[PDB]
Amino acid sequence: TYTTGSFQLILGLNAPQVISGEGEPEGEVFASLASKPEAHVQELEIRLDKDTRYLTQHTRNLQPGDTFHALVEPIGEAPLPRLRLTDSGGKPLAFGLIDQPGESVELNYTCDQDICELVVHVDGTDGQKDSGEAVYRLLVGINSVFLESDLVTVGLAVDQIVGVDQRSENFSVVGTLKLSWHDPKLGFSPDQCGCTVKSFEDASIRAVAGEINLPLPSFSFYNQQGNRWSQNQVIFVTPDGRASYFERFTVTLQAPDFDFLAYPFDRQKFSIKVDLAVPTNMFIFNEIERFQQVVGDQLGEEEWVVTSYSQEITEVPFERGSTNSRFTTTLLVKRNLEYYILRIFVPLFLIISVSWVIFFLKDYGRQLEVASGNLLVFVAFNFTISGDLPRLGYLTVLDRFMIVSFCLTAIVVLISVCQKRLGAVGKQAVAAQIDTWVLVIYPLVYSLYIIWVYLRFFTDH
């Protein structure tokens, strides 16, 4: 291909030093710049929401002697906005003149210095935003009229969800980060190295920008807690201006999108947000690279499992009207449920049934002997399981079922006492009516409780 960049030209007439690399200017002048001009014109439909109501676009680079025209127009019946042109420093070079009919605010300028580096402004500063949807066609021209954000393709993949802190509403994950992006200003000329590839290893895009003193697409994991353990870190740059970043990492992230209210029947969102650290006007995320399986299927492992992974490009505001790209890889998860209903629920059931079948007995002495004894087994079992249950400072559904379960088992002891007295007073057919009396209201209440909670916690009621 053709190649690009800047050069130093030494021209010599009867001067053998010039072919030796040796340019010191001397003598009488013989040469210079050799010859409407070339024109460049651009469309863009700009949009002005409540969010974004001033907008500026840096122009790219006019020669002394170049003329610049720009025109705005309303898409619907939206108001005629304020137009102006300005240098990079903000000193004004023109203003918009609203036209003969009053439909287009046009502006004009031709160029003074050997660099004119112009900036176009359009504002909807004039009125209160009524529904925040007035949008404009903007025409622009000199005689790629606007200098555009270079386009980065980002990719992410997770290998291990290695920690979840349920109390502090955060988690930890191991994964792989790739950004690939074509910027000519990066360009390596080959004869220096003697290679196609230049490598920077073990440092942060930020640090390499600082070393090179140029702009690069730096980023941060948005909710990062403390430090990240990054290995196989690297950034590759070819001659072309094609560049790539590769980083396996192990990061700890705050996710207060946790809700543990329906534990263990809760489901959760692990979101891995990757924001840039430079605005939309310099770099933006343009593609998603499916460089590997996004979520890595080791299934035996099992503690939290994965429903679906959706990873997506979105632009978010930051300070100084920093609007910048954000690459959200967000895993959907649920707990391993066999662990809960087998280890917790099944046994619990049995403890509750023991209290219900001792109502059959009619030897209230013994009914109460077992009733009381089984309450201890309940409490006993309730702290067997207290380990896999986490302390948060608020009630999960399980904690809710468990209180009710205990309360019903304690009242069987209370009822059993009641009936034993009745037995020894010789109203034993009262106490036998009671026996069969409970036998049916009582497991009816467990079942109704459950229905209550399912509706209370699961059904948008």
Is residue 55 within 8 Å of residue 122, measured between CB atoms? Answer: yes
3-state secondary structure of 457: helix
- Residue 303 binding result from Ca ion, ligand LMT, a copy of itself, none, given CB thresholds of 5 to 8 Å by partner type: a copy of itself
Q: How many CB atoms lie within 10 A of CB 441?
A: 9
User: What track of x and - describes contact with a copy of itself for positions 227 through 256 (by CB under 8 A)?
Assistant: -----x-x-x-------x-x----------
* CA count, 13 A, side-chain hemisphere, 182: 4
Q: Does 340 bind Cl ion (CB under 5 A)?
A: no
Strand partners, 176: 157, 248
Judged by beta carbon, residue 125 or residue 353, the one nearer a copy of itself is 353
Partner touching 256 among Cl ion, Ca ion, a copy of itself, none, CB below 5 to 8 Å by kind? Ca ion
The structure tokens listed for 451 are 């229905």
**Contact window for Ca ion (CB under 5 A) among 56-64, 252-260, 290-298, 403-411:** 252-260
Binding Ca ion by CB under 5 A: which of 5, 25, 101, 256?
A: 256
Does residue 300 interact with Ca ion by CB under 5 A?
A: no
* Tokens found for residue 183: 């910027």
Under rule CB under 8 A, residue 162 binds a copy of itself: no
**Residues 362, 439 contacting (CB under 8 angstroms):** no
Binding flag, residue 343, a copy of itself (CB under 8 A): yes
CB atoms within 10 A of CB 169: 15
Residue 260: CB minimum distance to Cl ion, A:
18
Based on the shown chain and the rule CB under 8 A, indicate whether residue 133 belongs to the binding site for a copy of itself. no
Is 171 labeled as ligand-binding? Answer: no
Which region among 23-31, 160-168, 402-410, 412-420 touches Cl ion (by CB under 5 A)? 402-410
Q: Which is nearer to Cl ion, 406 or 454 (CB)?
A: 406
Rounded to whole angstroms, the Cα distance separating 68 from 109 reads 5
φ/ψ of 375, rounded to 5, equals: -60, -40
> What is the β-pairing status of strands 150-165 and 283-288?
parallel
Q: Which stretch binds Cl ion (CB under 5 A): 12-20, 63-71, 268-276, 398-406?
A: 398-406
Token digits of residue 370: 């077992």
The reply, when asked if residue 458 is annotated as ligand binding, is no
Residues 6+ away with beta carbon under 8 Å from 265? 337, 397, 457, 458
**Residue matched to tokens 């994965």:** 306
Phi-psi region of 59 (alpha: psi -120 to 50; beta: other; left: phi over 0): beta
Q: Which residue has the tokens 């497991």?
A: 443
Query: What is the nearest approach in angstroms of ligand LMT to the Cβ of residue 123?
Result: 46
Rounded Cα distance between 375 and 378, Å, is 5
DSSP 146: B
Using CB under 8 A, which of 97, 197, 450, 451 touches a copy of itself? 197
Which residues carry a binding-site annotation for Ca(2+)? 169, 256, 258, 299, 301-302
Which residues carry a binding-site annotation? 169, 256, 258, 299, 301-302
Binding site for a copy of itself (CB under 8 A): 197, 232, 234, 236, 244, 246, 302-304, 318-320, 335-336, 338-339, 342-343, 346-347, 350-351, 353-354, 357-358, 360-363, 365-366, 368-370, 372-377, 379-384, 386-388, 391-395, 399-400, 403, 406-407, 410-411, 413-414, 417-418, 420-421, 424
Binding site for Ca ion (CB under 5 A): 256
